[PDB]
Amino acid sequence: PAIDAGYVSQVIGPVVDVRFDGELPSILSSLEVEGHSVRLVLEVAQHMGDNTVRCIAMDSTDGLVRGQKVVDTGSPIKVPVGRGTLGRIMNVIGEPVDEQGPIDAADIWSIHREAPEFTEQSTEQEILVTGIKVVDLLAPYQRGGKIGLFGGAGVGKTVLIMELINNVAKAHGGFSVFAGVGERTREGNDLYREMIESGVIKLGAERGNSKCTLVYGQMNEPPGARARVALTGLTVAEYFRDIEGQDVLLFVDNIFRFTQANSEVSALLGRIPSAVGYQPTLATDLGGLQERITTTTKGSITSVQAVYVPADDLTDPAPATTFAHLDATTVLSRSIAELGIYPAVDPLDSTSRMLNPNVIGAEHYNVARGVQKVLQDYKNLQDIIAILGMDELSEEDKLTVARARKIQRFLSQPFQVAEVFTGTPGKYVDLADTISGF
Amino acid sequence: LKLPTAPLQLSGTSAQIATLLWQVAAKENQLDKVQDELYQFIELFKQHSELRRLATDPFVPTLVRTKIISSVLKDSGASEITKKLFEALADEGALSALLEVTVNYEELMLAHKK
Amino acid sequence: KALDELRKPKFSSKYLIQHVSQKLIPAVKEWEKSYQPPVIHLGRVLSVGDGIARVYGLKSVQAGELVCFDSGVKGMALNLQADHVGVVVFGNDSVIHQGDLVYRTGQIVNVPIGPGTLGRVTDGLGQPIDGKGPLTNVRSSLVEVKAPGIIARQSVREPLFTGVKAVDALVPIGRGQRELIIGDRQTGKTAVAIDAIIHQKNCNEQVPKAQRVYCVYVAVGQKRSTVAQLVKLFTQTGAMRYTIMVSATASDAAPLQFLAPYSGCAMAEYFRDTGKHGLIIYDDLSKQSVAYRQMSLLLRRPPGREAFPGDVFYLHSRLLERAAKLSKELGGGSLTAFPVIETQAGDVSAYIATNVISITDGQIFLETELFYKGIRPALN
Amino acid sequence: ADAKALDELRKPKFSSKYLIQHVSQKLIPAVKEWEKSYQPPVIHLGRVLSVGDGIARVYGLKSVQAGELVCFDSGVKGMALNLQADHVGVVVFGNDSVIHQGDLVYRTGQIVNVPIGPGTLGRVTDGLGQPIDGKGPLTNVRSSLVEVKAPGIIARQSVREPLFTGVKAVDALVPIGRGQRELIIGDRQTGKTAVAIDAIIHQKNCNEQVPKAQRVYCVYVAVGQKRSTVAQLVKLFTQTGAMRYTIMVSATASDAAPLQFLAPYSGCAMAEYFRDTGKHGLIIYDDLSKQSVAYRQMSLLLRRPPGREAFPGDVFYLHSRLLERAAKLSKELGGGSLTAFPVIETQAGDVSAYIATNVISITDGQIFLETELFYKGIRPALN
Ligand SMILES: Nc1ncnc2c1ncn2[C@@H]1O[C@H](COP(=O)(O)OP(=O)(O)OP(=O)(O)O)[C@@H](O)[C@H]1O
Numbered sequence A: 001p002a003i004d005a006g007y008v009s010q011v012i013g014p015v016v017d018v019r020f021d022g023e024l025p026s027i028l029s030s031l032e033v034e035g036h037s038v039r040l041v042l043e044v045a046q047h048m049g050d051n052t053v054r055c056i057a058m059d060s061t062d063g064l065v066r067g068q069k070v071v072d073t074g075s076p077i078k079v080p081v082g083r084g085t086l087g088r089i090m091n092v093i094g095e096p097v098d099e100q101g102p103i104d105a106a107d108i109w110s111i112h113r114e115a116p117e118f119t120e121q122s123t124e125q126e127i128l129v130t131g132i133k134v135v136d137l138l139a140p141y142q143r144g145g146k147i148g149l150f151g152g153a154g155v156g157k158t159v160l161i162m163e164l165i166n167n168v169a170k171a172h173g174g175f176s177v178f179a180g181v182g183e184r185t186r187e188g189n190d191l192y193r194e195m196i197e198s199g200v201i202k203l204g205a206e207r208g209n210s211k212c213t214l215v216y217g218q219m220n221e222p223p224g225a226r227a228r229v230a231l232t233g234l235t236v237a238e239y240f241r242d243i244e245g246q247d248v249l250l251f252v253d254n255i256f257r258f259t260q261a262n263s264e265v266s267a268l269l270g271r272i273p274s275a276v277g278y279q280p281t282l283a284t285d286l287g288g289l290q291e292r293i294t295t296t297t298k299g300s301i302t303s304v305q306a307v308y309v310p311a312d313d314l315t316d317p318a319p320a321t322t323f324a325h326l327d328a329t330t331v332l333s334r335s336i337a338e339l340g341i342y343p344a345v346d347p348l349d350s351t352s353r354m355l356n357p358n359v360i361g362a363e364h365y366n367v368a369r370g371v372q373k374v375l376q377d378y379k380n381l382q383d384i385i386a387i388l389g390m391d392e393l394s395e396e397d398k399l400t401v402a403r404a405r406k407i408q409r410f411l412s413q414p415f416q417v418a419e420v421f422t423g424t425p426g427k428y429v430d431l432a433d434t435i436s437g438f
Numbered sequence B: 001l002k003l004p005t006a007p008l009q010l011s012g013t014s015a016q017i018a019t020l021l022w023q024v025a026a027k028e029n030q031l032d033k034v035q036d037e038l039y040q041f042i043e044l045f046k047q048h049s050e051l052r053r054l055a056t057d058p059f060v061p062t063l064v065r066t067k068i069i070s071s072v073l074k075d076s077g078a079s080e081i082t083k084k085l086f087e088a089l090a091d092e093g094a095l096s097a098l099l100e101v102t103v104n105y106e107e108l109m110l111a112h113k114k
Numbered sequence C: 001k002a003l004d005e006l007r008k009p010k011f012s013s014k015y016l017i018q019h020v021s022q023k024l025i026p027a028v029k030e031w032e033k034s035y036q037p038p039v040i041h042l043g044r045v046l047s048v049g050d051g052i053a054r055v056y057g058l059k060s061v062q063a064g065e066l067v068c069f070d071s072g073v074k075g076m077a078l079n080l081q082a083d084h085v086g087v088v089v090f091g092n093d094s095v096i097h098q099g100d101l102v103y104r105t106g107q108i109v110n111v112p113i114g115p116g117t118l119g120r121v122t123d124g125l126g127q128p129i130d131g132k133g134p135l136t137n138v139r140s141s142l143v144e145v146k147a148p149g150i151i152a153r154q155s156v157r158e159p160l161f162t163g164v165k166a167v168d169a170l171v172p173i174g175r176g177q178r179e180l181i182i183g184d185r186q187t188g189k190t191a192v193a194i195d196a197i198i199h200q201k202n203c204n205e206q207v208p209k210a211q212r213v214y215c216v217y218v219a220v221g222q223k224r225s226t227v228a229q230l231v232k233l234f235t236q237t238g239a240m241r242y243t244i245m246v247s248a249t250a251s252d253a254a255p256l257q258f259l260a261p262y263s264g265c266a267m268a269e270y271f272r273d274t275g276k277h278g279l280i281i282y283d284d285l286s287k288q289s290v291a292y293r294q295m296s297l298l299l300r301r302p303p304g305r306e307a308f309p310g311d312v313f314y315l316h317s318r319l320l321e322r323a324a325k326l327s328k329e330l331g332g333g334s335l336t337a338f339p340v341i342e343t344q345a346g347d348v349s350a351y352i353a354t355n356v357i358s359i360t361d362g363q364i365f366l367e368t369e370l371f372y373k374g375i376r377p378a379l380n
Numbered sequence D: 001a002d003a004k005a006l007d008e009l010r011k012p013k014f015s016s017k018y019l020i021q022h023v024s025q026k027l028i029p030a031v032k033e034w035e036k037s038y039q040p041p042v043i044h045l046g047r048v049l050s051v052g053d054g055i056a057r058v059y060g061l062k063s064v065q066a067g068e069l070v071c072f073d074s075g076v077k078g079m080a081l082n083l084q085a086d087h088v089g090v091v092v093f094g095n096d097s098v099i100h101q102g103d104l105v106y107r108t109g110q111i112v113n114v115p116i117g118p119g120t121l122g123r124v125t126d127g128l129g130q131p132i133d134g135k136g137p138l139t140n141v142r143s144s145l146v147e148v149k150a151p152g153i154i155a156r157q158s159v160r161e162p163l164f165t166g167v168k169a170v171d172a173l174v175p176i177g178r179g180q181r182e183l184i185i186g187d188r189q190t191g192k193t194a195v196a197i198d199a200i201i202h203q204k205n206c207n208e209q210v211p212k213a214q215r216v217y218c219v220y221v222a223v224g225q226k227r228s229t230v231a232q233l234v235k236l237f238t239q240t241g242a243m244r245y246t247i248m249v250s251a252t253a254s255d256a257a258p259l260q261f262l263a264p265y266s267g268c269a270m271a272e273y274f275r276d277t278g279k280h281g282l283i284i285y286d287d288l289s290k291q292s293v294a295y296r297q298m299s300l301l302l303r304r305p306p307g308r309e310a311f312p313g314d315v316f317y318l319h320s321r322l323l324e325r326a327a328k329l330s331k332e333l334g335g336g337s338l339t340a341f342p343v344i345e346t347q348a349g350d351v352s353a354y355i356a357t358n359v360i361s362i363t364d365g366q367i368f369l370e371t372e373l374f375y376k377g378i379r380p381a382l383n
């Protein structure tokens, strides 16, 4: 009875230290606290010495006393994975929060997996058309690649990821996994009602024909829950990729909140802070997360991750670290949105590995490079036009400004998910129409 | 709660422990009864490599250390102040503070004879 | 050579002398006569200074529990440590000494919620400051409640009329929404908020009781004079019948300015949970982040951007996710938040500004250029 | 409190013995009652005091050297970095979840070393020397230290031989030498990996045309990149044939911070074999600004005090002692050369960053890639 049972030594916010007198759990092993108002799952983060582990609580620690019995589960956080998770909402620790009964688990997987090895990498640069003009033209998305939507709090990376759900996941043949990390709970409820209404989530007996799993760790949760709910979404996606052999879609709203939750818990783990205030382990935590999302030889994951830049600073270390993990960045800008252009994609800051003449053809590539050349020549003239006016420009440059002001209105597009508050109906645009227009 | 005043003020965390030890030994008229006990425990750390293991090894648990110190001093002909001091220093692994508590106790004691 | 390993001691537990003195004074044969230090449900202050008291003992205290000092000032067990408790003082810390007795109350930090709070001016902890006696028809609930989940909510359907023409036409606001009122100093943010409260009074007499809106106005970091003038306004417009006012002014301690939005949010969550409709205004929620930054830097936590703590986003997301529209199996009530963020020179790309923009549903940008051109309300 | 009476206490002054003969015959029957709770003492082996975030504080390990490979009992390797008075700070070459408090740490006797030789020519390797391409272990190869001091003044000679890169903007305006360190610096997605890759492809095209001694063996160190990019680069180098002369050292983003810290030194030690055996080497440290970040994490978790942008104070020495190993040796040392192409990513064109200015002050040349020249059609975007 006394074996495998530690007691709480100290409670520092979401960081709990548990003293195991008999035998210590492993790092990343999950613990459970006895006698709490909710199910309080701790995850062991450090061994501090003196028979003490240092844990990170998955729920709130308010109400914890420093004598409370803590049971080692002997395992990391295990969540239900399988086709029985489809059409269900689950939290960070795999509990069904949709009030539809328990989740019929095909298996229970640890949420901490090693990244797939170098021999299990698939290098197939295939395009994924989204119907968005600026996305399909200037930075096309890979079919089995990682996609970033960089944004600055109000520029439209939730409307863009909802339009990508509307356009891509309906034409897709596999399963989608939406991981909500640190976003609004109203947005999760809106997505649940829209997915129930559109039929991709079915309730009751026809639940097996639902094609989407929601994993929600929203911004009302403590930083222990927002730090590991992306790992739960990855586990549900990795079961479909590895075991089921499917092609998976994985939409992660605000992958920044994983980094922010780790920086929140890192100040109480007793670390010296790195640059502007983040944890010292930003790059390795982000790498250990993002290298689990990989198109392997036995399955593909098309990952679209919204990334939030904190104060419209792209030089902030948490988006600057994220930039090196993605195949196609779609940097949304505040100034493009203030011009009224939606989607507010910066054309001279969004890049992709698919913009190469040998993979998308020379015509599409030459059109995208010509549009970028005209936009860069207009951005070079942004100071002369401001302080002198357009009447002092050369006759060849006024044509450049006119064609650039035409192509930067033409990059904008109405969305089917934005028609509820804008009134105009959405437009899906084929790729050949975009190249033929530009 | 009324404790006799120490003859001189001293430093922190290993001299105020000796100051408190002198303050509670002067209440029981028990200064020279615990001074030789401090010296005897210094000789005990000199003798056994298994009793100074409790002061230096950080892998013995605090339960095991407190149970060695408590079940070794079963009233031992000794003062209760010494026994309630060493199971208190064994509860933190602060047994290495004995060799400076003895220095500050020597300072208080030879300041006690002016 | 055998004593070279002990020539300098190295240990944890900085309060080692306390654990030696709790063993040595009962070794005296005189002071086993009920001379015990109470350490189960009581505790002695070790250190006190800059609004944080370190408290020995309290071995049965919970994390986040409201404790009470012997002076009468209350506190909150924030850091439960291995050898002490880090208590955050909910008042002036000048009345706390070393060796003061700290009693635990047995309860997580709570405020009185209910129909007895309507009409009453309150500080950030629940006790009234309008001089009208204690809160009578009321009961205590926690200030730190987890927000309702995904099933507990439904889509926002019903309109909350502000009574402002520029607001109700161009940025319409539904019941259960969170709408940021953002702008520079003296651009009319408080004017929009109190027009909303007065208009809820004007519409409350013409709807049935299941459609009335009961307002909470949290004033964080304001002057006490402007709070008193606003209480006179809500009394002379009849709006105090449906309005609670929580008031953590600029003279109050920064833990009270940190906790007053959560206190007011619990007082409005009563109306949300009992099927009625609530409207809460966090006036100068930037000042709450300033108070929390003060508490974090005095707790020696490593600061991030603009010296703010890392959990300053969590500070406002905890608060604003509790404003929701509940589902039909939870009473169907709603709570509408109006957080107010003040910007410097119209910089809305600041840290706390962009944090609350990425939390709330919409924004009310009040431009400082239109406010001096006579265009009032200066809605961008 | 001073040491003189503290040394006087070494002389016995007990004056009574009514506890000494009582507890000395009472100690050993008390200790034997708890001998299953005791762990065996440790002197020349090690034992983990505390483990977390990739750092193990190891009790014991009396005769370890600084910078020495250690091996935990769970098989994962380590590196004894700061040897403090009561513990050793060991960085973990891998995931530290298999390390517990009380795990035995074994000293291996070796300072950290990688396999160097002709057997690495064609393999995809991790930052420690193990092959990750799934083609079996390393054959025809020998172990060499990763902390070789750079050749001095009398060992070098003047840089004369060209080593063309095949990029005519580079070979026309910023001409490389065969023992020269040339920094490719720019923003993200401005074509730095493209310049280094085209240099490697041009060495493949020139190695089938020159007589056996001007042949250039490339070594690509991928620090902090993701594994899909490294696999795409291996596919490129195999489908063009450049993998016959190329070694790839790959410490990806999923690897530990000491692996990414140590992978440029592993790649430089693998490339120094060709420099020391009379051949000519080409080394590309892609994302040296990620090796600096891994070093920052590794040193911050060892509780060393931070500096500019929380970097260590010795982050200049980290890149200087790495890049100074790229030399052109004298005729009595073979005449072999090694030319470095470190890569630094800047933030919004800020050249005045800490690591950027350090590596500019270290290397010989500079190759600046502006993001406004890139979008004006000028590819490569040479400033
Ligand atoms: N619609 C309006 N018409 C005329 N005057 C107005 C209007 N709104 C506000 N004012 C006046 O302008 C001033 C704005 O004060 P208010 O408290 O509304 O701004 P504020 O943004 O809250 O400023 P602060 O944050 O500094 O208190 C007040 O003196 C008020 O009398």
Ligand SMILES: Nc1ncnc2c1ncn2[C@@H]1O[C@H](COP(=O)(O)OP(=O)(O)OP(=O)(O)O)[C@@H](O)[C@H]1O
Pocket (backbone or CB within 6 Å): A323, A324, A352, A353, A354, A355, A356, D186, D187, D188, D189, D190, D191, D192, D193, D194, D195, D345, D379, D380
């Ligand atoms: N000479 C060129 N002609 C045409 N396109 C090029 C050229 N050089 C680079 N590019 C394009 O620029 C993009 C970025 O290339 P590269 O990866 O070399 O830059 P990088 O700075 O290494 O990027 P990152 O910072 O993400 O590592 C690639 O998609 C590539 O197709």
Ligand SMILES: Nc1ncnc2c1ncn2[C@@H]1O[C@H](COP(=O)(O)OP(=O)(O)O)[C@@H](O)[C@H]1O
Pocket (backbone or CB within 6 Å): A151, A152, A153, A154, A155, A156, A157, A158, A159, A160, A342, A343, A414, A415, A418, A422, C357, C358
């Ligand atoms: N494609 C679009 N069409 C019309 N309006 C848009 C579009 N994208 C964004 N917006 C506007 O910008 C705001 C962006 O909000 P959101 O999608 O939540 O972005 P973020 O998550 O970055 O804050 C919305 O309030 C919406 O009014």
Ligand SMILES: [Mg+2]
Pocket (backbone or CB within 6 Å): A157, A158, A183, A184
């Ligand atoms: Mg969003």
Ligand SMILES: [Mg+2]
Pocket (backbone or CB within 6 Å): C189, C190, C283
């Ligand atoms: Mg105001």
Ligand SMILES: [Mg+2]
Pocket (backbone or CB within 6 Å): D192, D193, D286, D287
């Ligand atoms: Mg690169």
